[PDB]
Design a protein around this ligand. Structure first.
Ligand SMILES: *[C@@H]1O[C@H](CO)[C@@H](O[C@@H]2O[C@H](CO)[C@@H](O)[C@H](O)[C@H]2NC(C)=O)[C@H](O)[C@H]1NC(C)=O
Ligand SMILES: *[C@@H]1O[C@H](CO)[C@@H](O)[C@H](O)[C@H]1NC(C)=O
Ligand SMILES: N[C@@H](CCC(=O)O)C(=O)O
Lengths: 147, 238, 150, 93, 183, 79, 43
């Protein structure tokens, strides 16, 4: 789940399913601690910017899929020689493909096989615009020293 | 008299005599009115079309490399378990530790801490921060400069190694790029409200930070006056 | 290697009377790395169909040197004959189609790599392999501005 | 003028049955994370010699308002040519 | 709010200029007896900043005859910056937003902090519940619709509704008789 | 305009009252009217500490009133 | 009538703060003129 790419919501309480123009996604829940709980999933609804691209891809090349949510970690990290998140799920083969805000880098490109990028990104810094400005020589901005 | 007449005649002065003196001073007085009126008008135009400047220049600034050499130290951090932390760790060690002693837990918490003065800078992905800057209650949040990445990369689909669908997915993505669907998708989902043309915020202080040049000039002038005074005194003493 | 004349990426300057390329420094006193290019003459390969050595340097020239040192291979850069990027056309109104320019020279066997600002699209991706993008940009319009009069 | 459209990047063209097609993609992504392609960008592509602007607050120069300087000089020369007439005015009238 | 004395200059600048006038005043007095009366220094230093003709004091020593010329030039810069700064307040305002119409990002992607609706069983409802690109806007609009056009305009006045879509022949009549709304 | 003219008359009356401690009402009103329309007209100033302080505070009134008039007029011509 | 720029003419209460300064100075001055009158008697 991301803010602009993958939006997760709840099903319609009237009919017990998702609305149109969306994709039914299924996350698992583990509540018991002393005993191991049988596989039990919930039914959510996923949409966003990457979901429409996935729909268009599935319409272009004919294949079927079944989305679900990751629960092991987040995007992917290598802890003691083992990959978590979506990177780890594709590596131990429970997922086939992973879609979302996964950025192509050299460390992950040795255990998976990324595709052509569909959007540019990188690293940036966000600061709050202060009430100040820049005008140290505003009185000298008028007529130069020649006149 | 001729120096006072052009800086708003204020100083007590004595006027000359006869027709010649009166006409020479009157033509000089007309010079002063035009010169003074265009100065205030030009200065007003500069204050109305001014433009702000960024606080920092990037990740290679002195505030990010030497935070302890200034005022109470600059506060910047990021959320761990990502790609930006792995990028920073391999290129900067002391900066990595300094920003790791200021860890966060999410994007919304980071924005709240930045709005409540609990943080000075937040380093994260480019598209996410651009979306957060283009969609905000007001336009208080902004990105340094005008929008710039430091580690160019992109979002891709992770498929299993040595597969048969990679070429087909790449061709489909390139076909979607060649038809124009990406522009429609970005106009539908990646639209913004803020980030208009950087006009003036109409500052209302004009404090000592901006008006220090006139005081420096007055100090230099009084120093030169004292120097000329002591020089004339030493010359008259000999 | 095949390159093309692009001002921000590939500079094409003639050699001196000796045969090598004249030295040149930047604003910080570091030498500029050049290479011996060999393409068509000044005007065109049409009437004066002969090749002369030249000098090459720019954004795409010092990048090939870094790849040549990491991958440990030797290169021999030359210029494209006709001076085009590449497109698929019709040949003498036949059932078959072919490419031209830099795109039709690699498939013919006269080259091994293409170090040039070549745009990754869908038409060219069905015949060759492109790598990860080394420069993100797009299309825009260039016009001439007016002069204000006070 | 205008925004960007048909955003696609540059690449290195290689044939399909090329053994080098895997080692090149692992060297470009490695040169984007260590700062190797930003030295190549600030050296050839980014010395912006002539700055642009829209409002462009222009400071007035000497020749910009030289018409006002001419007025004082003109009046002074005519005044002596007139001061001599004024001197002769006191003698004849 | 027209803070006449506090808007152009900050509170720290009004006190620094008021203290520097005494520095130049006593300096002219020391530059006279070393090569004016205790009262001459007080007016002449204040007779140039306030732009008023009071007294006939003037520096006689050549060493003090140059300090006064820069003193006079320092008062003109403050007055010229005072008027120029005051002219920036009445010409530059805060950038308002105001919905650009139906293609606004606040309407295509609705949330729980912006409410907009219309009148139920009219031809505005048929226009939204018929197109499939307007499916996400109709569901958020259906749960907030009102009964008549006279109850929805009052809701905008009491800050319980955010936007109201109706005919331009009626919405341009209330915007002219009620000076607290705009289309 | 009348709100400042009445205060001008009040200041003139205050100056007449202070004159007890050749300064008539005509020169007083002339100086006090010239001081706010850019002091240009030849005028004579009073005497003593009281006169000097009253005119100096009135002179500060004139500088602020004149500077906001030109700025407001400039805003109307630009919009 | 509606507008966007809306050039607003300043009223009496708009700049009433400047009127207060002259009156305040005048009343303090007599309260100070009496002190000044007593200053010439005692000093
Ligand atoms: C980043 O990953 C680490 C895992 O190494 C997370 O650390 C753990 O946090 C969970 C959540 O409270 C705890 O249950 C674990 O006991 C923690 N383990 C260790 C070794 O500290 C960390 O929370 C993650 N941070 C973010 C922002 O996702
Ligand atoms: C790391 O190595 C293996 C798992 O990869 C495990 O046996 C070992 O205990 C781990 N040690 C730590 C400190 O995580
Ligand atoms: N896209 C990153 C997470 C977000 C970030 O680090 O900015 C990843 O997949 O690791």
């Amino acid at each position: 789940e991301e803010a602009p790419f993958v939006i997760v919501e709840s099903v319609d309480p009237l009919s017990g399913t998702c609305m149109r123009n969306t994709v039914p996604c299924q996350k698992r829940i583990i509540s018991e601690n002393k005993t191991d709980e049988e596989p039990g999933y919930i039914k959510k609804c996923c949409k966003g910017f990457c979901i429409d691209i996935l729909k268009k891809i599935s319409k272009s090349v004919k294949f079927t899929y079944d989305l679900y949510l990751v629960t092991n970690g987040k995007h992917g990290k290598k802890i003691n020689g083992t990959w978590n998140g979506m990177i780890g799920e594709v590596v131990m083969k429970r997922a086939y493909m992973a879609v979302g805000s996964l950025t192509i880098n050299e460390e992950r490109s040795e255990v998976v096989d990324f595709s052509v990028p569909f959007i540019e990104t990188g690293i940036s810094v966000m600061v709050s615009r202060s009430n100040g400005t820049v005008s140290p020589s505003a009185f000298l901005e008028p007529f130069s020293a020649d006149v | 008299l001729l120096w006072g007449l052009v800086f708003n005649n204020s100083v007590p002065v004595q006027n000359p005599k006869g027709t010649t003196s009166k006409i020479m001073v009157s033509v000089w007085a007309f010079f002063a009115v035009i010169f003074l009126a265009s100065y205030t008008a030009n200065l007003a135009a500069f204050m109305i079309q001014e433009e702000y400047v960024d606080q920092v220049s990037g990740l290679s600034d002195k505030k990010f490399q030497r935070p302890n050499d200034f005022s109470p130290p600059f506060r910047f951090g990021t959320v761990p378990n990502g790609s930006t932390e792995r990028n920073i760790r391999n290129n900067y060690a002391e900066m990595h530790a300094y920003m790791g002693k200021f860890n966060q837990r999410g994007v919304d918490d980071a924005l709240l801490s930045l709005k409540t003065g609990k943080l000075d800078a937040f380093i994260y992905d480019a598209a996410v921060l651009n979306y957060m800057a283009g969609r905000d209650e007001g336009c208080k949040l902004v990105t340094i400069g005008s929008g710039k990445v430091f580690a160019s990369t992109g979002y891709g689909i992770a498929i299993q190694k040595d597969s048969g669908w990679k070429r087909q997915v790449d061709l489909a993505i390139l076909q979607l790029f060649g038809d124009g669907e990406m522009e429609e998708l970005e106009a539908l989902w990646l639209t913004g409200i803020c980030h208009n043309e950087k006009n003036e915020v109409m500052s209302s202080q004009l404090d000592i930070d901006n008006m220090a040049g006139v005081f420096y000039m007055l100090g230099a002038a009084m120093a030169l006056s004292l120097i000329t005074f002591i020089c004339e005194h030493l010359f008259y003493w000999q | 290697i095949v390159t093309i004349h692009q001002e921000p990426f590939v500079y094409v300057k003639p050699t001196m009377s000796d045969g090598t390329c004249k030295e040149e420094f930047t604003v910080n006193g570091d030498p500029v790395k050049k290479v011996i290019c060999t393409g068509p003459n000044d005007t065109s390969p049409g009437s004066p169909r002969h090749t002369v050595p030249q000098c090459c340097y720019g954004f795409c020239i010092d990048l090939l040197i870094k790849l040549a040192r990491t991958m440990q291979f030797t290169y021999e850069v030359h210029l494209v004959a006709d001076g085009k990027f590449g497109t698929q056309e019709r040949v003498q109104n036949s059932n078959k189609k072919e490419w031209n320019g830099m795109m039709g020279e690699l498939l013919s066997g006269q080259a091994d790599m293409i170090v040039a600002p070549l745009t990754i699209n869908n038409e060219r991706a069905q015949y060759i392999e492109f790598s990860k993008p080394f420069k993100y940009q797009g299309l825009t319009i260039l016009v001439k501005k007016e002069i204000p009069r006070s | 003028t205008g925004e960007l459209f048909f955003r696609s990047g540059f690449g290195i063209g290689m044939r399909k049955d090329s053994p080098w097609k895997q080692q090149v993609s692992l060297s470009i992504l490695k040169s984007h994370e260590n700062g190797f392609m930003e030295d190549l960008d600030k050296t050839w592509v980014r010395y912006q010699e002539c700055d642009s602007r829209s409002n462009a607050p222009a400071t007035l120069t000497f020749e910009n308002m030289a018409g006002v300087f001419m007025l004082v000089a003109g009046g002074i020369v005519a005044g002596i040519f007139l001061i001599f007439i004024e001197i002769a005015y006191k003698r004849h009238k | 709010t027209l803070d006449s004395f506090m808007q152009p200059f900050q509170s720290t600048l009004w006190l620094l200029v008021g203290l520097s006038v005494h520095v130049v005043a006593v300096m002219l007095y020391l530059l006279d007896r070393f090569s004016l009366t205790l009262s001459s220094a007080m007016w002449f230093s204040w007779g140039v900043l306030l732009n008023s003709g009071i007294g006939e004091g003037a520096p006689r020593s050549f060493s003090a005859r140059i300090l006064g010329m820069v003193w006079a030039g320092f008062a003109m810069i403050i007055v010229a910056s005072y008027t120029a700064n005051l002219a920036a307040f009445l010409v530059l305002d805060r950038p308002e937003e105001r919905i650009t119409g139906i293609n606004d990002p606040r309407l295509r992607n609705p949330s729980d902090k912006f409410i907009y609706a219309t009148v139920k069983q009219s031809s505005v409802d048929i226009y939204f519940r018929r197109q499939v690109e307007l499916s996400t806007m109709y569901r958020h609009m259906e749960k907030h619709n009102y009964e008549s056009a006279a109850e929805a305009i009052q809701a905008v006045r009491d800050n319980k509704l955010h936007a109201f879509i109706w005919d331009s022949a009626v919405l341009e009549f209330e915007a002219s008789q009620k000076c607290d709304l705009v289309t | 305009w009348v709100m400042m003219f009445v205060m001008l008359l009040i200041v003139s009356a205050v100056a007449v009252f202070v004159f007890e401690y050749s300064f008539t009402i005509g020169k007083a009103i002339w100086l006090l009217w010239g001081l706010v329309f850019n002091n240009s007209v030849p005028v004579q100033n009073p005497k003593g500490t009281t006169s000097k302080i009253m005119v100096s505070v009135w002179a500060f009134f004139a500088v602020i009133f004149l500077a906001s008039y030109t700025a407001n007029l400039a805003a109307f011509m630009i919009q």
